[PDB]
Design a protein around this ligand. Structure first.
Ligand SMILES: Cc1cc2nc3c(=O)[nH]c(=O)nc-3n(C[C@H](O)[C@H](O)[C@H](O)COP(=O)(O)OP(=O)(O)OC[C@H]3O[C@@H](n4cnc5c(N)ncnc54)[C@H](O)[C@@H]3O)c2cc1C
Length: 430
Protein backbone atom coordinates (compact mmCIF):
# COMPACT_ATOMS: atom_id res chain seq x y z
CA UNK A 1 0.00 0.00 0.00
CA UNK A 2 1.61 3.23 -1.33
CA UNK A 3 0.51 6.73 -0.27
CA UNK A 4 -0.50 5.53 3.28
CA UNK A 5 -3.64 3.96 1.65
CA UNK A 6 -4.84 7.26 0.16
CA UNK A 7 -6.79 7.31 -3.18
CA UNK A 8 -7.65 10.44 -5.24
CA UNK A 9 -11.27 11.45 -4.44
CA UNK A 10 -11.46 12.36 -8.22
CA UNK A 11 -10.66 9.22 -10.26
CA UNK A 12 -9.28 9.94 -13.80
CA UNK A 13 -8.76 7.81 -16.89
CA UNK A 14 -5.07 8.36 -17.71
CA UNK A 15 -3.69 7.19 -21.10
CA UNK A 16 0.06 6.33 -20.94
CA UNK A 17 1.85 6.17 -24.30
CA UNK A 18 4.62 3.53 -24.08
CA UNK A 19 4.98 0.31 -22.08
CA UNK A 20 8.69 0.84 -21.30
CA UNK A 21 10.19 1.03 -17.78
CA UNK A 22 8.77 4.58 -17.31
CA UNK A 23 5.27 3.79 -18.57
CA UNK A 24 5.01 0.64 -16.40
CA UNK A 25 6.25 2.56 -13.32
CA UNK A 26 3.71 5.35 -14.11
CA UNK A 27 0.92 2.78 -14.66
CA UNK A 28 1.66 1.16 -11.27
CA UNK A 29 1.98 4.47 -9.31
CA UNK A 30 -1.12 6.11 -10.95
CA UNK A 31 -3.33 2.99 -10.42
CA UNK A 32 -2.17 2.83 -6.75
CA UNK A 33 -3.02 6.60 -6.55
CA UNK A 34 -6.65 5.65 -7.43
CA UNK A 35 -6.77 6.23 -11.23
CA UNK A 36 -7.84 4.05 -14.18
CA UNK A 37 -4.85 3.49 -16.49
CA UNK A 38 -4.61 2.44 -20.14
CA UNK A 39 -1.10 1.82 -21.54
CA UNK A 40 -0.74 1.98 -25.39
CA UNK A 41 2.41 0.30 -26.82
CA UNK A 42 3.72 0.13 -30.46
CA UNK A 43 5.38 -3.32 -30.02
CA UNK A 44 3.31 -6.39 -31.07
CA UNK A 45 4.65 -8.20 -27.95
CA UNK A 46 7.10 -7.60 -25.10
CA UNK A 47 10.30 -9.48 -26.07
CA UNK A 48 13.68 -10.61 -24.73
CA UNK A 49 15.29 -7.27 -25.72
CA UNK A 50 17.81 -4.84 -24.19
CA UNK A 51 20.91 -5.23 -22.07
CA UNK A 52 22.27 -4.02 -18.70
CA UNK A 53 20.49 -1.29 -16.68
CA UNK A 54 21.92 0.66 -13.65
CA UNK A 55 19.61 0.41 -10.58
CA UNK A 56 21.20 2.94 -8.19
CA UNK A 57 20.02 3.18 -4.55
CA UNK A 58 17.56 6.05 -5.38
CA UNK A 59 15.73 3.56 -7.73
CA UNK A 60 16.10 0.47 -5.49
CA UNK A 61 14.56 2.50 -2.61
CA UNK A 62 11.34 2.92 -4.69
CA UNK A 63 11.29 -0.70 -6.09
CA UNK A 64 11.56 -2.03 -2.44
CA UNK A 65 8.70 0.35 -1.47
CA UNK A 66 6.69 -1.25 -4.33
CA UNK A 67 7.20 -4.79 -2.86
CA UNK A 68 9.99 -5.87 -5.28
CA UNK A 69 12.80 -6.40 -2.65
CA UNK A 70 13.06 -10.23 -2.97
CA UNK A 71 12.20 -10.40 -6.73
CA UNK A 72 14.98 -7.95 -7.69
CA UNK A 73 17.52 -9.62 -5.33
CA UNK A 74 16.75 -12.85 -7.22
CA UNK A 75 17.44 -11.60 -10.80
CA UNK A 76 19.86 -8.61 -10.38
CA UNK A 77 23.54 -8.43 -9.25
CA UNK A 78 25.05 -6.17 -6.57
CA UNK A 79 28.41 -4.87 -7.96
CA UNK A 80 31.12 -4.83 -5.21
CA UNK A 81 33.08 -1.91 -6.77
CA UNK A 82 33.67 0.19 -9.90
CA UNK A 83 37.19 -0.50 -11.24
CA UNK A 84 39.03 1.67 -13.79
CA UNK A 85 41.69 -0.06 -15.92
CA UNK A 86 44.22 1.00 -18.60
CA UNK A 87 42.99 -0.47 -21.94
CA UNK A 88 46.38 -1.80 -23.10
CA UNK A 89 47.65 -3.64 -19.99
CA UNK A 90 44.53 -3.94 -17.73
CA UNK A 91 46.42 -2.01 -14.97
CA UNK A 92 43.89 -1.07 -12.25
CA UNK A 93 44.36 2.73 -11.88
CA UNK A 94 41.04 3.36 -10.06
CA UNK A 95 38.74 1.66 -7.52
CA UNK A 96 35.65 2.81 -5.55
CA UNK A 97 34.10 0.28 -3.11
CA UNK A 98 30.37 -0.23 -3.74
CA UNK A 99 28.57 -3.26 -2.22
CA UNK A 100 27.78 -2.64 1.50
CA UNK A 101 29.12 0.95 1.19
CA UNK A 102 26.09 1.73 -1.12
CA UNK A 103 23.68 0.85 1.81
CA UNK A 104 24.73 4.20 3.38
CA UNK A 105 22.46 5.75 0.66
CA UNK A 106 19.72 3.56 2.18
CA UNK A 107 19.41 0.77 -0.45
CA UNK A 108 21.68 -1.42 -2.62
CA UNK A 109 22.99 -0.56 -6.09
CA UNK A 110 21.85 -3.30 -8.54
CA UNK A 111 22.75 -4.28 -12.13
CA UNK A 112 19.82 -5.85 -14.04
CA UNK A 113 18.97 -7.08 -17.54
CA UNK A 114 16.32 -4.62 -18.96
CA UNK A 115 14.03 -7.65 -19.77
CA UNK A 116 14.14 -8.84 -16.09
CA UNK A 117 13.53 -5.24 -14.89
CA UNK A 118 10.66 -4.89 -17.45
CA UNK A 119 9.15 -8.24 -16.21
CA UNK A 120 9.27 -7.02 -12.53
CA UNK A 121 7.43 -3.76 -13.35
CA UNK A 122 5.07 -5.54 -15.81
CA UNK A 123 3.90 -8.13 -13.16
CA UNK A 124 3.42 -5.22 -10.67
CA UNK A 125 1.31 -3.05 -13.04
CA UNK A 126 -0.54 -5.75 -15.10
CA UNK A 127 -3.45 -6.43 -12.61
CA UNK A 128 -4.38 -2.67 -12.55
CA UNK A 129 -3.95 -1.52 -16.15
CA UNK A 130 -5.50 -2.12 -19.57
CA UNK A 131 -2.55 -2.76 -21.99
CA UNK A 132 -3.04 -2.24 -25.79
CA UNK A 133 -0.13 -3.81 -27.73
CA UNK A 134 0.39 -3.29 -31.54
CA UNK A 135 -0.96 0.23 -30.88
CA UNK A 136 1.35 2.96 -32.32
CA UNK A 137 0.12 6.45 -31.28
CA UNK A 138 0.27 8.61 -34.47
CA UNK A 139 -1.78 11.63 -33.29
CA UNK A 140 -2.69 13.49 -30.08
CA UNK A 141 -5.52 15.97 -29.60
CA UNK A 142 -4.02 17.71 -26.55
CA UNK A 143 -7.26 19.77 -25.84
CA UNK A 144 -9.73 16.85 -25.54
CA UNK A 145 -7.42 15.10 -24.70
CA UNK A 146 -7.30 11.95 -26.89
CA UNK A 147 -4.88 9.70 -28.82
CA UNK A 148 -5.17 8.38 -32.39
CA UNK A 149 -3.69 4.96 -33.20
CA UNK A 150 -2.23 3.86 -36.60
CA UNK A 151 -5.57 1.96 -37.17
CA UNK A 152 -7.47 5.31 -36.84
CA UNK A 153 -8.98 4.26 -33.45
CA UNK A 154 -9.34 7.32 -31.13
CA UNK A 155 -8.86 6.74 -27.31
CA UNK A 156 -10.35 9.33 -24.89
CA UNK A 157 -8.91 10.09 -21.43
CA UNK A 158 -8.67 12.87 -18.80
CA UNK A 159 -4.81 13.05 -18.99
CA UNK A 160 -2.24 11.72 -21.49
CA UNK A 161 1.23 10.78 -20.20
CA UNK A 162 3.94 10.53 -22.89
CA UNK A 163 6.33 7.73 -21.77
CA UNK A 164 7.22 6.92 -25.41
CA UNK A 165 11.02 7.19 -25.03
CA UNK A 166 13.96 9.02 -26.68
CA UNK A 167 12.03 9.47 -30.00
CA UNK A 168 8.68 10.32 -28.30
CA UNK A 169 5.76 11.23 -30.56
CA UNK A 170 3.98 12.89 -27.57
CA UNK A 171 7.05 15.16 -27.05
CA UNK A 172 6.47 16.73 -30.54
CA UNK A 173 2.85 17.59 -29.53
CA UNK A 174 3.91 19.04 -26.10
CA UNK A 175 6.76 21.22 -27.42
CA UNK A 176 5.72 21.81 -31.10
CA UNK A 177 8.73 19.98 -32.64
CA UNK A 178 11.11 17.04 -31.97
CA UNK A 179 13.79 18.13 -29.45
CA UNK A 180 17.03 18.78 -31.48
CA UNK A 181 19.58 15.93 -31.27
CA UNK A 182 23.34 16.47 -31.95
CA UNK A 183 25.67 13.49 -32.77
CA UNK A 184 28.46 13.22 -30.17
CA UNK A 185 30.73 11.53 -32.78
CA UNK A 186 30.47 8.21 -30.89
CA UNK A 187 28.50 4.95 -31.11
CA UNK A 188 27.99 2.18 -28.49
CA UNK A 189 28.11 -1.59 -29.09
CA UNK A 190 26.13 -3.62 -26.55
CA UNK A 191 26.91 -7.33 -26.25
CA UNK A 192 26.17 -10.12 -23.74
CA UNK A 193 28.08 -13.39 -23.25
CA UNK A 194 27.16 -16.26 -20.92
CA UNK A 195 29.35 -16.34 -17.75
CA UNK A 196 29.65 -20.19 -18.20
CA UNK A 197 32.38 -19.56 -20.89
CA UNK A 198 34.19 -17.12 -18.52
CA UNK A 199 34.11 -19.66 -15.63
CA UNK A 200 35.93 -22.09 -18.04
CA UNK A 201 38.89 -19.59 -18.45
CA UNK A 202 41.01 -19.09 -15.25
CA UNK A 203 41.84 -15.49 -16.46
CA UNK A 204 38.07 -14.58 -16.87
CA UNK A 205 36.56 -16.59 -13.94
CA UNK A 206 37.45 -13.87 -11.34
CA UNK A 207 35.15 -11.41 -13.22
CA UNK A 208 32.26 -13.77 -12.36
CA UNK A 209 33.43 -14.75 -8.80
CA UNK A 210 33.83 -11.06 -7.73
CA UNK A 211 31.16 -9.04 -9.58
CA UNK A 212 32.48 -5.54 -10.34
CA UNK A 213 31.71 -2.75 -12.80
CA UNK A 214 34.99 -2.59 -14.81
CA UNK A 215 35.79 0.30 -17.19
CA UNK A 216 38.79 -0.25 -19.52
CA UNK A 217 39.78 3.27 -20.73
CA UNK A 218 41.39 3.62 -24.20
CA UNK A 219 42.22 6.23 -26.90
CA UNK A 220 38.80 7.39 -28.17
CA UNK A 221 37.20 4.21 -26.68
CA UNK A 222 36.09 2.45 -23.48
CA UNK A 223 34.68 -0.95 -22.50
CA UNK A 224 32.33 -1.09 -19.50
CA UNK A 225 31.50 -4.63 -18.24
CA UNK A 226 29.39 -6.14 -15.41
CA UNK A 227 27.35 -9.24 -14.42
CA UNK A 228 23.55 -9.30 -14.88
CA UNK A 229 20.84 -12.01 -14.53
CA UNK A 230 22.22 -13.37 -11.19
CA UNK A 231 25.78 -13.61 -12.74
CA UNK A 232 24.56 -15.90 -15.56
CA UNK A 233 25.29 -13.18 -18.16
CA UNK A 234 28.15 -10.67 -18.63
CA UNK A 235 27.05 -7.30 -20.05
CA UNK A 236 29.55 -5.28 -22.13
CA UNK A 237 29.08 -1.79 -23.56
CA UNK A 238 31.83 -0.51 -25.95
CA UNK A 239 32.08 3.19 -26.90
CA UNK A 240 33.98 4.00 -30.09
CA UNK A 241 34.06 6.74 -32.81
CA UNK A 242 30.92 6.59 -34.99
CA UNK A 243 31.80 4.73 -38.24
CA UNK A 244 28.08 4.75 -39.26
CA UNK A 245 25.22 3.84 -36.95
CA UNK A 246 21.56 4.66 -36.22
CA UNK A 247 19.71 5.69 -33.07
CA UNK A 248 17.65 2.47 -32.73
CA UNK A 249 17.39 -0.35 -30.11
CA UNK A 250 17.24 -2.98 -32.95
CA UNK A 251 20.22 -1.75 -35.11
CA UNK A 252 23.02 -4.33 -35.57
CA UNK A 253 26.79 -3.89 -35.39
CA UNK A 254 29.49 -6.19 -36.82
CA UNK A 255 31.07 -8.39 -34.05
CA UNK A 256 34.13 -8.60 -36.35
CA UNK A 257 34.40 -4.76 -36.65
CA UNK A 258 33.89 -4.52 -32.81
CA UNK A 259 36.79 -7.00 -32.24
CA UNK A 260 38.91 -5.04 -34.74
CA UNK A 261 38.18 -1.66 -33.01
CA UNK A 262 39.29 -3.12 -29.61
CA UNK A 263 42.25 -5.19 -30.89
CA UNK A 264 44.81 -3.15 -28.81
CA UNK A 265 43.08 -3.82 -25.43
CA UNK A 266 44.61 -6.34 -22.99
CA UNK A 267 44.42 -10.11 -23.65
CA UNK A 268 41.49 -10.67 -21.18
CA UNK A 269 39.42 -8.15 -23.25
CA UNK A 270 40.48 -10.05 -26.46
CA UNK A 271 39.22 -13.32 -24.82
CA UNK A 272 35.93 -11.65 -23.68
CA UNK A 273 35.19 -10.17 -27.12
CA UNK A 274 36.08 -13.51 -28.87
CA UNK A 275 32.89 -14.95 -27.22
CA UNK A 276 30.61 -12.17 -28.68
CA UNK A 277 28.33 -13.97 -31.23
CA UNK A 278 26.40 -10.76 -32.05
CA UNK A 279 26.21 -7.09 -31.02
CA UNK A 280 23.70 -4.25 -31.30
CA UNK A 281 25.03 -0.72 -32.10
CA UNK A 282 23.52 2.69 -31.12
CA UNK A 283 24.53 6.13 -32.47
CA UNK A 284 25.03 8.48 -29.48
CA UNK A 285 23.00 11.69 -29.81
CA UNK A 286 23.13 14.59 -27.30
CA UNK A 287 19.71 16.16 -26.37
CA UNK A 288 19.26 19.25 -24.14
CA UNK A 289 16.64 19.55 -21.35
CA UNK A 290 13.14 20.63 -22.56
CA UNK A 291 11.75 24.10 -21.72
CA UNK A 292 8.54 22.39 -20.48
CA UNK A 293 7.06 18.88 -20.07
CA UNK A 294 3.39 19.99 -19.99
CA UNK A 295 1.32 21.00 -23.08
CA UNK A 296 -0.28 24.51 -22.82
CA UNK A 297 -3.78 22.90 -22.39
CA UNK A 298 -2.54 21.28 -19.11
CA UNK A 299 -3.79 17.76 -20.00
CA UNK A 300 -0.68 16.16 -21.64
CA UNK A 301 2.73 15.68 -19.95
CA UNK A 302 5.96 13.76 -20.54
CA UNK A 303 7.75 11.14 -18.39
CA UNK A 304 11.10 9.41 -18.81
CA UNK A 305 13.26 9.39 -21.95
CA UNK A 306 10.51 11.42 -23.82
CA UNK A 307 11.75 14.43 -21.75
CA UNK A 308 15.24 13.61 -20.28
CA UNK A 309 17.20 10.94 -22.23
CA UNK A 310 20.95 10.76 -21.53
CA UNK A 311 24.27 9.36 -22.78
CA UNK A 312 25.47 5.91 -21.60
CA UNK A 313 28.42 7.33 -19.50
CA UNK A 314 26.04 7.60 -16.49
CA UNK A 315 22.94 5.73 -17.79
CA UNK A 316 20.38 7.08 -15.21
CA UNK A 317 17.50 6.85 -17.81
CA UNK A 318 15.63 4.13 -15.86
CA UNK A 319 16.35 5.90 -12.52
CA UNK A 320 14.90 9.26 -13.67
CA UNK A 321 11.86 7.58 -15.39
CA UNK A 322 11.01 5.69 -12.14
CA UNK A 323 11.55 8.80 -9.97
CA UNK A 324 9.28 10.74 -12.40
CA UNK A 325 6.56 8.06 -11.97
CA UNK A 326 6.87 8.10 -8.13
CA UNK A 327 6.46 11.93 -7.94
CA UNK A 328 3.66 11.99 -10.59
CA UNK A 329 1.78 9.15 -8.75
CA UNK A 330 2.31 10.92 -5.38
CA UNK A 331 0.83 14.23 -6.66
CA UNK A 332 -2.04 12.45 -8.46
CA UNK A 333 -2.99 10.59 -5.23
CA UNK A 334 -4.02 14.10 -4.01
CA UNK A 335 -6.47 14.96 -6.86
CA UNK A 336 -10.00 15.97 -5.76
CA UNK A 337 -11.11 18.54 -8.45
CA UNK A 338 -10.50 19.12 -12.21
CA UNK A 339 -9.05 22.66 -11.58
CA UNK A 340 -6.03 20.89 -9.85
CA UNK A 341 -5.08 18.68 -12.89
CA UNK A 342 -2.94 21.40 -14.61
CA UNK A 343 -1.35 22.71 -11.36
CA UNK A 344 -0.43 19.11 -10.37
CA UNK A 345 1.23 18.51 -13.80
CA UNK A 346 3.13 21.88 -13.37
CA UNK A 347 4.17 20.82 -9.82
CA UNK A 348 5.37 17.42 -11.19
CA UNK A 349 7.52 19.24 -13.77
CA UNK A 350 8.72 21.82 -11.21
CA UNK A 351 9.88 19.11 -8.76
CA UNK A 352 11.59 16.99 -11.45
CA UNK A 353 13.02 19.19 -14.22
CA UNK A 354 16.27 20.59 -12.64
CA UNK A 355 17.21 17.23 -11.01
CA UNK A 356 16.79 15.39 -14.34
CA UNK A 357 18.67 18.18 -16.25
CA UNK A 358 21.58 17.88 -13.71
CA UNK A 359 21.51 14.07 -14.24
CA UNK A 360 21.63 14.45 -18.06
CA UNK A 361 24.61 16.87 -17.54
CA UNK A 362 26.43 14.38 -15.24
CA UNK A 363 26.37 11.86 -18.12
CA UNK A 364 27.23 14.50 -20.82
CA UNK A 365 30.33 15.73 -18.85
CA UNK A 366 31.84 12.19 -18.63
CA UNK A 367 32.30 11.77 -22.44
CA UNK A 368 35.98 12.68 -22.85
CA UNK A 369 37.58 11.62 -19.53
CA UNK A 370 37.52 7.79 -20.32
CA UNK A 371 38.60 8.32 -23.98
CA UNK A 372 41.83 10.37 -23.54
CA UNK A 373 44.62 9.36 -25.93
CA UNK A 374 47.88 8.12 -24.30
CA UNK A 375 49.95 11.06 -23.01
CA UNK A 376 50.11 13.67 -20.19
CA UNK A 377 46.30 14.12 -19.88
CA UNK A 378 45.85 10.31 -19.69
CA UNK A 379 48.73 9.87 -17.10
CA UNK A 380 47.25 12.73 -14.91
CA UNK A 381 43.77 11.07 -14.89
CA UNK A 382 45.40 7.69 -13.97
CA UNK A 383 47.42 9.48 -11.22
CA UNK A 384 44.25 11.16 -9.84
CA UNK A 385 42.38 7.84 -9.86
CA UNK A 386 45.33 6.07 -8.16
CA UNK A 387 45.45 8.66 -5.36
CA UNK A 388 41.70 8.08 -4.61
CA UNK A 389 42.15 4.27 -4.93
CA UNK A 390 45.06 4.20 -2.43
CA UNK A 391 42.73 5.78 0.25
CA UNK A 392 40.07 3.09 -0.51
CA UNK A 393 42.80 0.37 -0.06
CA UNK A 394 44.21 1.89 3.15
CA UNK A 395 40.79 1.28 4.79
CA UNK A 396 40.91 -2.46 3.81
CA UNK A 397 32.51 13.45 -5.62
CA UNK A 398 30.79 11.82 -2.56
CA UNK A 399 28.45 14.83 -2.11
CA UNK A 400 27.17 14.46 -5.70
CA UNK A 401 26.71 10.68 -5.09
CA UNK A 402 24.64 11.49 -1.97
CA UNK A 403 22.48 14.03 -3.94
CA UNK A 404 21.86 11.32 -6.66
CA UNK A 405 21.72 8.08 -4.58
CA UNK A 406 20.15 9.39 -1.33
CA UNK A 407 17.17 11.03 -3.15
CA UNK A 408 13.70 9.85 -2.01
CA UNK A 409 11.06 10.78 -4.64
CA UNK A 410 8.11 10.24 -2.22
CA UNK A 411 9.78 12.32 0.56
CA UNK A 412 10.27 15.24 -1.88
CA UNK A 413 6.58 15.16 -3.05
CA UNK A 414 5.16 14.52 0.51
CA UNK A 415 7.12 17.53 1.86
CA UNK A 416 6.13 19.85 -1.00
CA UNK A 417 2.48 18.79 -0.52
CA UNK A 418 2.69 19.49 3.25
CA UNK A 419 4.56 22.85 3.00
CA UNK A 420 2.83 24.28 -0.14
CA UNK A 421 0.64 22.05 -2.32
CA UNK A 422 -2.12 21.23 0.20
CA UNK A 423 -2.82 24.98 0.61
CA UNK A 424 -2.12 26.20 -2.96
CA UNK A 425 -3.48 23.23 -4.99
CA UNK A 426 -5.61 21.19 -2.58
CA UNK A 427 -8.02 24.12 -1.94
CA UNK A 428 -8.78 24.68 -5.71
CA UNK A 429 -12.48 24.01 -6.41
CA UNK A 430 -13.66 24.83 -2.80
C1 LIG B 1 13.39 -2.29 -26.90
C2 LIG B 1 14.24 -1.38 -26.04
C3 LIG B 1 15.51 -1.76 -25.67
C4 LIG B 1 16.31 -0.93 -24.85
N1 LIG B 1 17.57 -1.37 -24.50
C5 LIG B 1 18.32 -0.56 -23.79
C6 LIG B 1 19.65 -0.97 -23.41
O1 LIG B 1 20.12 -2.08 -23.65
N2 LIG B 1 20.38 -0.09 -22.65
C7 LIG B 1 19.92 1.13 -22.30
O2 LIG B 1 20.67 1.85 -21.65
N3 LIG B 1 18.66 1.53 -22.58
C8 LIG B 1 17.90 0.72 -23.30
N4 LIG B 1 16.63 1.13 -23.65
C9 LIG B 1 16.16 2.43 -23.15
C10 LIG B 1 15.82 2.39 -21.66
O3 LIG B 1 14.63 1.61 -21.49
C11 LIG B 1 15.55 3.81 -21.17
O4 LIG B 1 16.73 4.61 -21.33
C12 LIG B 1 15.06 3.94 -19.73
O5 LIG B 1 15.65 2.94 -18.90
C13 LIG B 1 13.54 3.90 -19.61
O6 LIG B 1 12.99 5.03 -20.35
P1 LIG B 1 11.45 5.10 -20.83
O7 LIG B 1 10.62 4.03 -20.23
O8 LIG B 1 11.10 6.55 -20.72
O9 LIG B 1 11.58 4.74 -22.40
P2 LIG B 1 11.75 3.38 -23.24
O10 LIG B 1 12.34 2.33 -22.39
O11 LIG B 1 12.43 3.74 -24.53
O12 LIG B 1 10.26 2.93 -23.58
C14 LIG B 1 9.41 3.71 -24.44
C15 LIG B 1 8.35 2.77 -24.95
O13 LIG B 1 7.45 3.55 -25.78
C16 LIG B 1 7.12 2.81 -26.93
N5 LIG B 1 6.71 3.75 -27.96
C17 LIG B 1 7.53 4.62 -28.62
N6 LIG B 1 6.87 5.36 -29.46
C18 LIG B 1 5.54 4.99 -29.33
C19 LIG B 1 4.35 5.41 -29.96
N7 LIG B 1 4.30 6.39 -30.86
N8 LIG B 1 3.19 4.81 -29.59
C20 LIG B 1 3.25 3.85 -28.65
N9 LIG B 1 4.31 3.35 -28.02
C21 LIG B 1 5.44 3.97 -28.41
C22 LIG B 1 8.37 2.00 -27.24
O14 LIG B 1 8.00 0.88 -27.99
C23 LIG B 1 8.85 1.62 -25.83
O15 LIG B 1 8.33 0.38 -25.37
C24 LIG B 1 15.81 0.33 -24.43
C25 LIG B 1 14.52 0.71 -24.82
C26 LIG B 1 13.73 -0.11 -25.62
C27 LIG B 1 12.33 0.34 -26.00
Amino acid sequence: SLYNGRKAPLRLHILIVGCGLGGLAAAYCLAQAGHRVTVVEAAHAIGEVGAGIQVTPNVTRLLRRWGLADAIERVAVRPEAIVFRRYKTGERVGYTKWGDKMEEYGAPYYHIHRADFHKLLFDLAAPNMTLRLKSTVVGVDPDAPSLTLASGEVLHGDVIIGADGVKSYVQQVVIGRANPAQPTGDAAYRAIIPTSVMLEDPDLKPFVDTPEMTAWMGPGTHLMAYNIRAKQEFNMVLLHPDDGSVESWTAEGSAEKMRADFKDYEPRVQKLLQHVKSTLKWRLMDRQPLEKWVHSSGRVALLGDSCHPMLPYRAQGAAMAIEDAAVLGNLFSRLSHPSQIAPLLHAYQNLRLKRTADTQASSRLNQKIFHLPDGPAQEARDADMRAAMELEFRLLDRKKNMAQFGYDADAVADRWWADVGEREIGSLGQ
